Scaffold this active site. Structure first.
Site, PDB file in Angstrom:
ATOM      1  N   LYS A 100      53.942   9.214  60.702  1.00 30.14           N
ATOM      2  CA  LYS A 100      54.322   7.727  60.378  1.00 30.14           C
ATOM      3  C   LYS A 100      53.037   6.954  60.419  1.00 30.14           C
ATOM      4  CE  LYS A 100      58.201   9.554  62.019  1.00 30.14           C
ATOM      5  NZ  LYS A 100      58.523  10.931  62.221  1.00 30.14           N
ATOM      6  N   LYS A 150      56.309  10.796  71.107  1.00 34.06           N
ATOM      7  CA  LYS A 150      55.579  12.561  70.805  1.00 34.06           C
ATOM      8  C   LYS A 150      53.865  12.309  71.724  1.00 34.06           C
ATOM      9  CE  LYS A 150      58.630  13.547  67.519  1.00 34.06           C
ATOM     10  NZ  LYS A 150      59.293  12.449  67.441  1.00 34.06           N
ATOM     11  N   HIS A 190      55.894  14.152  58.032  1.00 34.80           N
ATOM     12  CA  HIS A 190      56.696  13.708  59.374  1.00 34.80           C
ATOM     13  C   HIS A 190      55.812  12.938  60.141  1.00 34.80           C
ATOM     14  CE1 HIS A 190      58.532  14.091  63.296  1.00 34.80           C
ATOM     15  NE2 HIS A 190      59.764  14.348  62.868  1.00 34.80           N
ATOM     16  N   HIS A 207      61.790   8.943  71.015  1.00 34.04           N
ATOM     17  CA  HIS A 207      61.281   9.510  69.900  1.00 34.04           C
ATOM     18  C   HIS A 207      59.453   9.807  70.265  1.00 34.04           C
ATOM     19  CE1 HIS A 207      64.554   7.776  66.956  1.00 34.04           C
ATOM     20  NE2 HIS A 207      64.416   9.286  66.908  1.00 34.04           N
TER      21      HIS A 207
HETATM   22  S1  LIG Z   1      68.722  14.796  66.753  1.00 36.80           S
HETATM   23  O1  LIG Z   1      69.824  14.344  67.459  1.00 36.80           O
HETATM   24  O2  LIG Z   1      68.234  15.996  67.117  1.00 36.80           O
HETATM   25  O3  LIG Z   1      68.706  14.228  65.255  1.00 36.80           O
HETATM   26  C1  LIG Z   1      68.701  13.064  64.639  1.00 36.80           C
HETATM   27  C2  LIG Z   1      69.984  12.284  65.291  1.00 36.80           C
HETATM   28  C3  LIG Z   1      70.053  11.229  64.624  1.00 36.80           C
HETATM   29  C4  LIG Z   1      69.327  10.762  63.295  1.00 36.80           C
HETATM   30  C5  LIG Z   1      68.589  11.442  63.067  1.00 36.80           C
HETATM   31  C6  LIG Z   1      67.930  12.810  63.587  1.00 36.80           C
HETATM   32  C7  LIG Z   1      66.946  13.756  63.030  1.00 36.80           C
HETATM   33  C8  LIG Z   1      67.255  14.315  62.016  1.00 36.80           C
HETATM   34  C9  LIG Z   1      66.139  15.385  61.571  1.00 36.80           C
HETATM   35  C10 LIG Z   1      64.882  15.344  62.210  1.00 36.80           C
HETATM   36  C11 LIG Z   1      64.722  14.285  63.088  1.00 36.80           C
HETATM   37  C12 LIG Z   1      63.379  14.134  63.699  1.00 36.80           C
HETATM   38  O4  LIG Z   1      62.355  14.705  63.084  1.00 36.80           O
HETATM   39  C13 LIG Z   1      63.135  12.803  64.582  1.00 36.80           C
HETATM   40  C14 LIG Z   1      61.551  12.653  65.298  1.00 36.80           C
HETATM   41  O5  LIG Z   1      61.626  11.658  66.044  1.00 36.80           O
HETATM   42  O6  LIG Z   1      60.762  13.264  65.094  1.00 36.80           O
HETATM   43  C15 LIG Z   1      64.335  12.199  65.087  1.00 36.80           C
HETATM   44  N1  LIG Z   1      65.458  12.302  64.447  1.00 36.80           N
HETATM   45  C16 LIG Z   1      65.720  13.455  63.453  1.00 36.80           C
END
Ligand SMILES: *S(=O)(=O)Oc1ccccc1-c1cccc2c(=O)c(C(=O)O)c[nH]c12
EC number: 3.1.4.-
Length: 441
Positions: A329, A104, A327, A102
């Site tokens: 946190k 960035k 989006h 996750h």
């Molecule tokens: S991913 O495989 O592309 O998406 C997932 C998978 C599992 C749980 C949640 C998500 C998910 C959905 C929508 C937005 C997401 C997002 O913005 C992030 C992030 O870290 O920015 C992560 N997962 C997201």
């Protein structure tokens, strides 16, 4: 403004509220540096879109994409990047189930030096269009002269800590970036790095990551004040994990205990959680599709209804962004009247055990599933006892070096009795959104 904390530009708000915000095209602009190469750490990528955000003259400079995808998802990302011979990929190992990459971050190598960007947006159009997102911009780090022996280290240990974060990947493409960082002077850095990496950490390593890292920094570099029990904790996020059958399982045992740490010495402390309601989402600039990036599932939610009594609406009049769904946190420690804060954190980490870590083995081991990254603003790192909260995010304070730009409204407003947390996989068909549509997943 010594903080260099920014929001992304939002399409649709008055220019007032985008003056001093940053689009990705601004970050990559030649005015920030003459790009030689870059690394883009992220979760989701639209490679065609991403290359177009670089200046034309820089679009064929080497780019490294650091991702967590596997199997078919991995193959899709390689197919996206195949047309661009200058793009390399680094698959971050995810050896613990249900973990994700996750983090960035941009590493931007220039002819003039090096810049680090830690932020909250995926590299897709929608994340930079009408969402509230946060960015920390490092200073331009100059290169240390060849033959010069100096640390290049900051009083916050950021250089060693960033290298340590990269070392956890054990990846040859990132060893190259570690050597780049070694060659630059990062001493001006006034934020502390707070990372999560996947693993099971015992002993000394316990304090390196996740919520124990936050606790260690607050123990070591913040001071406890009288009536500290009255200073609330605020957590603000765009998704929630499975936290357990009640607040004692994780949220107000180990997680709140780390968040409420101040100083070396040894709960009444209010906990405010900010998460968009259904109405927040329905009336947003995007409408219900904003909820596509607020991935709280009904399966998780129905097992922890106790949690929703902590939830406060998203409101951001101070930055003109009440209708730009979060989006970003953030986590912070305001004074009882919300006029000051003891610290502020912007991070990729949502409110989940996967992101922050969960104690195992009789409290001796912190297990983290995911890669996450944020930066912590501590008053001590600026010669201060506390930060005054900026009253208007984009306005001109009387002492900007002492006034932190909190991007949403204080005090947070509790959900009303008719409000519900946004849950992305159930239908909403009673009232249409700002584009005229219902939500039928
Ligand atoms: S991913 O495989 O592309 O998406 C997932 C998978 C599992 C749980 C949640 C998500 C998910 C959905 C929508 C937005 C997401 C997002 O913005 C992030 C992030 O870290 O920015 C992560 N997962 C997201």
């Amino acid at each position: 403004n010594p903080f260099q904390f920014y929001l992304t530009r939002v399409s649709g708000v008055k220019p007032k509220y985008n003056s001093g915000a940053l689009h990705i095209k601004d970050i990559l602009s030649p005015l920030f540096g003459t790009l030689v190469s870059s690394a883009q750490f992220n979760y989701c990528f639209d490679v065609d879109w991403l290359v177009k955000q670089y200046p034309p003259e820089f679009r064929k400079k080497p780019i490294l994409l650091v991702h967590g995808d596997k199997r078919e998802a991995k193959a899709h990302l390689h197919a996206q990047a195949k047309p661009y011979e200058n793009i390399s990929l680094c698959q971050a190992k995810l050896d613990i189930a249900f973990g994700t990459h996750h983090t960035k971050m941009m590493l931007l190598l220039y002819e003039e030096g090096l810049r680090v960007v830690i932020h909250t947006s995926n590299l897709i159009h929608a994340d930079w269009h009408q969402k509230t997102q946060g960015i920390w911009l490092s200073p331009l780090y100059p290169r240390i002269a060849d033959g010069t022996h100096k640390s290049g280290e900051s009083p916050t240990h950021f250089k060693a800590d960033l290298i340590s974060y990269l070392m956890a990947y054990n990846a040859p493409s990132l060893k190259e970036w570690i050597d780049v960082i070694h060659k630059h002077d990062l001493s001006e850095t006034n934020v502390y790095l707070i990372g999560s990496t996947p693993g099971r950490f015992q002993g000394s390593q316990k304090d390196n990551w996740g919520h124990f890292r936050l606790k260690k920094l607050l123990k070591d570099h913040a001071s406890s004040m009288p009536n500290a029990e009255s200073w609330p904790v605020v957590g603000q996020f765009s998704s929630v994990g499975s936290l357990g059958a009640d607040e004692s399982k994780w949220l107000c045992s180990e997680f709140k205990e780390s968040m409420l740490t101040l100083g070396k010495e040894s709960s009444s402390v209010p906990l405010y959680l900010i998460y968009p309601s259904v109405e927040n989402v329905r009336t947003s600039l995007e409408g219900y599709p904003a909820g596509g990036s607020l991935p709280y599932s009904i399966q998780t939610a129905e097992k922890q209804n106790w949690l929703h009594s902590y939830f406060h609406k998203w409101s951001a009049e101070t930055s003109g962004r009440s209708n730009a769904m979060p989006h970003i946190k953030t986590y912070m420690r305001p004074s009882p009247d919300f006029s000051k804060i003891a610290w502020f954190l912007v991070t990729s980490a949502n409110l989940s055990k996967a992101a922050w870590g969960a104690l195992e083995k009789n409290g001796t081991q912190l297990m983290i599933r995911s890669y996450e990254l944020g930066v912590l603003f501590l008053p001590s790192a600026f010669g201060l006892d506390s930060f005054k909260v900026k009253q208007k995010f984009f306005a001109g304070s009387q002492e900007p070096m002492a006034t932190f730009p909190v991007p949403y409204d204080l005090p947070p407003e509790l959900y009303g009795s008719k409000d519900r947390p946004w849950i992305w996989n159930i239908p909403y068909v009673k009232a249409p959104d700002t584009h005229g549509n219902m939500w039928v997943p």
